[PDB]
Symmetry: C4
Subunit: 503 residues, 4 copies
């Protein structure tokens, strides 16, 4: 396969694409932007102006299998063609059974057969425009379509590897405490799957407090029905609903994994505010609260991926990033700081603003992606090490101090919009990227005096070779008292090589 | 003849031009803009930028017959030539005896002979710059000139049919309770024409309340002088004045109809405010109040056409549009909403902003006319059916609900300027055109649940074939909860094909 | 001579240039703009953009005769050359003895010999930077230089006639009650010249009140010294000072007139405010107060020309324009209204903004001059007749009514900046030029009704032929109720041909 | 040598470059702008737009001798090459031991050997990032590197003379009362060098009051230790610290002077406010207070050069300019007035805004340098004479009166930004350059009347020949009452030739 997840020596998961470490400097199209060849093809030049290396774009079941057993390859073919012609990799979003909780992208022939493909019912007993995750017929039909899609991708792309990941479904779940379908009501009475129980036993001290605290308040049982093991409440309802979604979607993924295994992720509509109960967000989706349930149920899903539109960026990405869950953000705001934070602080695989085609001639964002592209080798090499950090000022913060081997770095912000990353490349050498901040280097050991030795500004050329544009000194470094990450001027992030010394 | 009015199966009158249904996406030039070949010819490129299919332009008697019996074809010839070269049809306005009530376009040789062509007198006894409608000499001279014009048009245009309609005179009437000319005073004493009496008898329950109520308050007589049948008052004065105008102008039209019958309309200066008595507007013109008198008197005039500059657009067009009177608006404001309302709600033949050459690079208006042009076949096919409506928000309105077969449509406005039209093309299919509104589809029958199935955005190509630009779903339809008529973006009206379904 | 003043049948003086009536649509350069060939030549294209037919430009004595008896033809030659190449006539300003009262343009060899060329003395006894008009040596030297200049112009221009007028000196006089030079003090005691006395006798009832009232308060004597005939006061001082200037400058002109007689004018710095006594303005200059003295003394000076920078334009031009003194304005503001007023109301020979090279791309002024150029034949033909008037609104005015044969014209202003002219070309025909006003035509005789018959907008082509651009009617003339002088649109003055009629 | 300092007949020092008087119309690059060939080469076209004749640019020791005994000629070679190709001379700044007091440009191999190259110690005993001026090893290493640099310049530039001056080090000194290094503490106890004593004896009445007053308050001794001759205080500390710096740097210069003597200057960080004690500015630098110490100690340094960023420009330049110290300003603000003041009032050798590459398309500054370039021959010829002055209005000033031979000049300012210069070129002739001021010429002798005779505006062509663009008179000189230095218009300084006369 031309795309694979591989753990490095620091325990960090890396994307390896066509034999090399690859980070998705990505963007996701608006939902309807890949619905015709002509509309998509109008976008490619726009996208290139932003220095993307990867485009996230949907394939809709309703278009792909417009009558049962009849498959239309037009949109996937043109999508791969245009990606190749314009220098992009693709992550394919499968808008099948569910997108933002609902079934609006299911085929006309699925929608119209509510007997074969039964719907979620509300507490009021109303069938909604959502296929129930307890419907096995729907599971099989989606799975067959998805597999056919992936089979096709292998048949047209197994050598080039334009397609480097897959997202089955999109932000699944129900805006309800539970599905009131008869099948759902019967499932709630069943025994808790052993696979869940054993997962909880084996990984107890690393479990989500939201799961552990509910398990333990019911006596941490190793058998029983859902209401026995987890009590009769909103959480028990959320847990078995989540188990169902992860299980349905795991089967869908399994079918693809058997014929052409690519990195696979499912994305979640986040718990928007901290008191929100399941169903105010999509109940069943892979929010961090239920991460353990998804891991237990869905081993053919590699990553649980947050869609982040909220301002509390650093806390959110820290919440989703775990040893068993690399950070992968398929939908976000068009804010360069976020990118630098995700890649530098958390070794992310992907950063991707949503509706990216809208953001053409966001010059600063484009130049940010240019600089990140220059740094992909260096970032890759340091994923998971304590020698790489991000930099991102949040309102009300003024400085960040960190230890890097022999040195203490004091990062002070010169403007509200201040961001970058810092890599220690040698005992007395650092690469600093970004804008609107300063770095003071001092000695960890107080018997010694540490100082900047020399500073160069520059970039990496197309061969990956460092080229200095200036040796910064005098005013430009306050006579080596400080690194000023002023940025590249046309202002956008710069790259600075700093040597230090101890006397 | 290459232009004709024909009633379809729904009882709606259609313009059939060169064998096909035609709707005038029109504009009228400023009054003096066709007075030389050079000034007119300077306008054509401007007009094309607005996507007109039809130009309304005057021929002035004073220029056409500058000495009695001598005819100058220069302006009509160049007008037809330029229309052909720039892809426009023409409706010819005949500024003869009267324009905005007055006789300023009559030839020098008519103006200067007030014995042969006697004037209206005021109550003070003053002769004004208006030829009296009781002057038979003036009737004959105008009629002869008009016929000569039309004879010429046949001789140069009978095959191509560049000229598709005729407007004899322009907003006729007097700013007076009545003409005080001796002939006028003698006419007021005469017997009411039987043709009027019989019209009133035959069409009593469909008569204008303004006419019926006056007739019935005088005892609904079937014989007598004007003051007998209608009482001695302002209304009796207006009625016999109107009879005179319609009769004079009918004779003028009759002469043309005999040699080359084209759709013929007379236009009115509207009753500007509801209390206004005859003479505050031109007394004698085809305002809706006297529509029955004009129909009775002038069978060679096909349509009575309002000139609408007032904001109460929907009430006005509803007032002029009758089973015997299609809506045809030769003069209006340059407001796209009005166009969509007139064509969609009332199956109008014509919408035409006045001084159109001024409005070049009114981009939104131009794109509106582009979209209407795309829809002419579909609009044509649905003229007079209960499956086509207009959409136009007025201040203080928030929604419009309508029944369309099995579905209830709730139209909600997203901005003040919200307009379009809606056609049901199938039991479960709709075409929605416009901007700044949303449509919710639900089931008429409350035992059933109705929903959007699929939504496409697109347009009709030059062959008249539908071409989708996107399948709208997800954010673009709130996951098929609603049709968002956002418009085509460059914002101007869009076209959306919606399929629905019942479960 | 290729330029001459000739009185027409209405008593009006006309400029006849190369055999045809010519009106100077003129501009005067800044003072130093003709001081090198290179600076002047940089201006010609600018000037052409303003549609000038005539440029007023200086020749400075100091440059022309830089050593006594040595003459430098460079600047006059290049000036005539560039005028020819760019389609302009020239009026030559001779900055000799005096410019704005002073002698700053006299040659270095005149300035430095205050014995040979004695100065004006102040009352304090100080010699100033002004050559005394009582210095005969200075008179002769200036006269010889001026004649040499004109001799040269004949020698290079007698056939083409690029040079069409001459201005000897520039705004002469002293900022003093009188010259206190010994020669001046001796002149004040002399007998009043008979030529003055006889002029006063012969033209008594047409004399300036300022002169007559002083003469008559001293007993209207026919002999005596200045203080006898005019009393011992400021006026007597001004009169004999003025006599001296006019006499000195007449001799200068006489020398030129003998070899090559061209229209010759002297220009005055105006009495700036009504109480100002001689010497607050240049005492001796041809202000209107002393017009009779200049006429008496200086028969080789054809015209006394006001330099008008003040806002009271209509009163000023009425004050300078007399039967023996055509209106000629060599220096004015760049205001088109002023031009139309001067040419239309007062049949002026010249209108000329000062520092004209500054005003390039004053579009409105340029288009004004274009329209005047079109009208020169028609204006010429009506100079001095009661069938041509100007139009110019001043603050606080609202209308102007005039009688033109059978018609009464009511001119009503539609904006503050409203101006043009009106010519009756036939008993029932008028040409109206301008902008921002309206004209109502009614019958002089109240037994008759007068009205507009027809209105055309247009212009005169390069052959001088009228070409209509539109027949204005309907909205454009309120149905012949009024002429609307809206202007040519791109707004600037238009030309309108109006026919009228009486019934 | 192709560049040399030579005293003219007025006692003024002139730069003679390639055989001719040369004034540096200069600019200094930002500190890091000559750190790569590519960054420098990006600037040349920018610099040419400003009409510089000279660029000041650094060579950094750390780059030039990156390992001991290994020399890298890349940056000096490319610098000379680009200067030649773009028409500039160079003054080379040697950023060696010290730049703005500190040692940030010393080689890595100097910084890292604090035993061989010992640092300054603070009063707290801390070694700082400054090489001590008492370190002989550092003196020798710097001197050897500097000499190698100059040897190279001779080897590549001895014929062309692109390099016309040298600045060893940059704003030297310590932010301390004294160096607390053991060597520094031992030096403070030593005998005052005789060379200082004798200098003070010989030049007593011309000594800086700051030095003389301290010497005399300690009894004006001719022998003793520093604390004996100058007391035990801050001044004694500053004096021996300054002696040390001047001595160290003199040795560095001496090595170069032996093989290739060019004009050499050292620049100072100014006493920023009048109460500031040594160490608030760099203690040891050539501020004016210690000018005598630098002259005594450092005969191989030709000029002590102020870096002026403060608004008190006229007082500062008067303070640094002495008979033994021409004015040379290598760092200043980009303000044209300053340039005119320095060159005109004080016959400066150099005016140079800092960060000049930033100021491209400062049009006014560029045109100022154009005009100065035109005047270099005339300025050169009048350096040190009482016939050349500067003109520069400071806030709160309104006029300046000066005597120039027979004439009194009253300079009155017409705007805040008013500046230029004035040269008397003959008994009755003046050249006035500048903008926004006026000059009134009157007679020194009150028995005589002095006046402007004639005024020309113009410039010097590429051959150095005067070319008048206009003879200014009339309005342009108020009829020779005044010279108006209005400027060249596109507004920037003009050049005006004025002749005057006495009667
Ligand atoms: O723009 C809203 C956004 O909401 C979620 O993040 C979905 O995953 C996206 O497809 C889109 O609907
Ligand atoms: O612009 C005013 C307008 O008034 C009426 O509608 C007329 O029919 C038009 O010709 C025009 O006069
Ligand atoms: O601009 C002022 C103006 O004043 C007078 O009118 C002069 O005749 C002109 O030459 C000029 O000096």
């Amino acid at each position: 396969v031309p795309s694979r997840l591989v753990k490095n020596e620091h325990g960090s998961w890396q994307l390896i694409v066509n034999g090399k470490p690859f980070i998705m400097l990505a963007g996701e199209l608006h939902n309807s932007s890949a619905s015709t060849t002509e509309y998509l093809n109008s976008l490619w030049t726009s996208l290139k102006t932003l220095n993307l290396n990867t485009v996230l774009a949907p394939i809709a079941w309703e278009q792909f299998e417009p009558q049962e057993g009849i498959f239309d390859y037009t949109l996937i073919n043109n999508m791969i063609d245009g990606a190749r012609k314009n220098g992009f990799k693709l992550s394919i979003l499968w808008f099948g059974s569910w997108k933002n909780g609902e079934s609006s992208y299911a085929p006309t022939w699925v929608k119209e057969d509510t007997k074969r493909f039964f719907r979620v019912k509300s507490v009021e007993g109303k069938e909604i425009e959502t296929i129930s995750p307890f419907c096995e017929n729907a599971m099989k039909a989606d799975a067959k379509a998805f597999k056919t899609l992936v089979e096709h991708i292998k048949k047209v792309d197994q050598a080039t590897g334009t397609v480097i990941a897959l997202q089955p479904e999109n932000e699944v779940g129900i805006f309800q405490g539970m599905d009131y379908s008869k099948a759902s009501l019967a499932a709630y009475e069943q025994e808790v799957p052993q696979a869940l129980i054993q997962y909880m036993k084996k990984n107890r001290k690393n479990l989500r407090k939201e799961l552990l605290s509910v398990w333990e308040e019911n006596g941490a049982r190793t058998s029983g029905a859902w209401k026995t093991v987890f009590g009769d409440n909103a959480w028990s309802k959320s847990f078995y609903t989540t188990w169902q979604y992860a299980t349905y979607i795991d089967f869908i993924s399994a079918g693809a994994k058997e014929i052409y295994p690519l990195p696979t992720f499912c994305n979640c509509w986040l718990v928007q505010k901290p008191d929100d109960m399941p169903g105010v967000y999509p109940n069943g989706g892979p929010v961090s609260r239920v991460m353990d349930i998804w891991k237990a149920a869905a081993p053919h899903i590699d990553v649980l991926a947050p869609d982040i539109y909220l301002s509390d960026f650093k806390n959110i990405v820290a919440d989703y990033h775990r040893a068993d869950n690399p950070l992968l953000i398929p939908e976000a705001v068009m804010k360069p700081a976020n990118a630098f934070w995700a890649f530098g602080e958390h070794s992310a695989l992907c950063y991707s603003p949503f509706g990216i085609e809208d953001g053409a001639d966001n010059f600063v964002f484009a130049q940010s992606y240019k600089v990140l592209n220059e740094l992909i080798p260096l970032i890759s090499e340091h994923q998971g090490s304590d020698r790489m950090i991000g930099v991102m000022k949040m309102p009300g913060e003024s400085e960040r101090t960190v230890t890097m081997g022999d040195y203490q770095l004091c990062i002070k912000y010169d403007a509200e919009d201040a961001y970058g990353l810092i890599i220690q490349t040698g005992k007395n050498e650092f690469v600093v990227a970004g804008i609107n901040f300063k770095v003071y280097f001092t000695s960890t050991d107080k018997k010694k005096t540490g100082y900047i030795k020399q500073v160069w500004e520059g970039g990496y050329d197309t061969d990956g070779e460092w080229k200095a544009t200036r040796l910064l000194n005098g005013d430009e470094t306050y006579h080596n008292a400080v690194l000023i990450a002023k940025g590249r001027r046309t202002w956008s992030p710069g790259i600075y090589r700093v040597t230090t010394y101890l006397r």
